[PDB]
UniProtKB/Swiss-Prot annotation:
Name of this protein: Filamin-A
Compartments where found: Cytoplasm, Cell cortex; Cytoplasm, Cytoskeleton; Perikaryon; Cell projection, Growth cone
Organism: Homo sapiens (Human)
Lineage of source species: Eukaryota, Metazoa, Chordata, Craniata, Vertebrata
Effect of K97R: Abrogates ASB2alpha-mediated degradation without altering ASB2alpha binding
Residues of the full protein shown: 39 to 265 of 2647
Disease: Periventricular nodular heterotopia 1: A developmental disorder characterized by the presence of periventricular nodules of cerebral gray matter, resulting from a failure of neurons to migrate normally from the lateral ventricular proliferative zone, where they are formed, to the cerebral cortex. PVNH1 is an X-linked dominant form. Heterozygous females have normal intelligence but suffer from seizures and various manifestations outside the central nervous system, especially related to the vascular system. Hemizygous affected males die in the prenatal or perinatal period.
Length: 215
């Protein structure tokens, strides 16, 4: 089923918004971080710093690749970023679930905490922007597309002035209007698509990733 690939899709676009700065790309999150080059580049963009150690520019062999990743994880520690049971080989060997967990950790830190739990903090920011709306979660509340219109308009009143009269039975249409307004006018990229964000089975962490760009 396609909703299972929403997290991977969303994390991949998020990663690519940052790798654009250093002219790099990820096509496949399972393979493309395994030599440690794109992971390191990503970290340098996110932290606006350089690594503490030299790495292997050309990690032709496995061992050089494990080294590269090990530099990256040492960096994460130096920066006091707590990693959830991740080792060099999990990344080099293409363990997708652990790789997704690593990226989620970077999103939480750099997109939510750095700019009470990260969830509570984002949720609270949104709640303050939308006092007339009982926001309690990062899935169902967002499914009609109307809360997105509300959020975009609170950020710049006049972008989606009529969100409140939007037809709740037009989720994709509502979401696209809101998200494209935020893209064109607030510079908020669509690291989740409108079709993905209103999915009955949308990954909440993916929704948080998208919304963490508003603050």
């Amino acid at each position: 089923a396609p909703w299972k690939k929403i997290q991977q899709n969303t994390f991949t676009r998020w990663c690519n918004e940052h790798l654009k700065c250093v002219s790099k790309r990820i096509a496949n999150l399972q393979t493309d971080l395994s030599d440690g080059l794109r992971l390191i580049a990503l970290l340098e963009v996110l932290s606006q710093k350089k690594m503490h150690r030299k790495h292997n520019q050309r990690p032709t062999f496995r061992q050089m690749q494990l080294e590269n990743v090990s530099v990256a994880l040492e960096f994460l520690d130096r920066e006091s970023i707590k990693l959830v049971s991740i080792d060099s080989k999990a990344i080099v060997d293409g363990n997708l679930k652990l790789i997704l967990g690593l990226i989620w950790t970077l999103i939480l830190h750099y997109s939510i905490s750095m700019p009470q739990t990260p969830k509570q903090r984002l949720l609270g920011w949104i709640q303050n922007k939308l006092p007339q709306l009982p926001i309690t979660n990062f899935s169902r509340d967002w499914q009609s597309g109307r809360a997105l219109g509300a959020l975009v308009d609170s950020c710049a009143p006049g972008l989606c002035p009529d969100w409140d009269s939007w037809d709740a039975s037009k989720p994709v249409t509502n979401a696209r209007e809101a998200m494209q307004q935020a893209d064109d006018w607030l510079g908020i990229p669509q690291v989740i698509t409108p079709e993905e964000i209103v999915d009955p089975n949308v990954d909440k962490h993916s929704v948080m990733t998208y919304l963490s760009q508003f603050p």
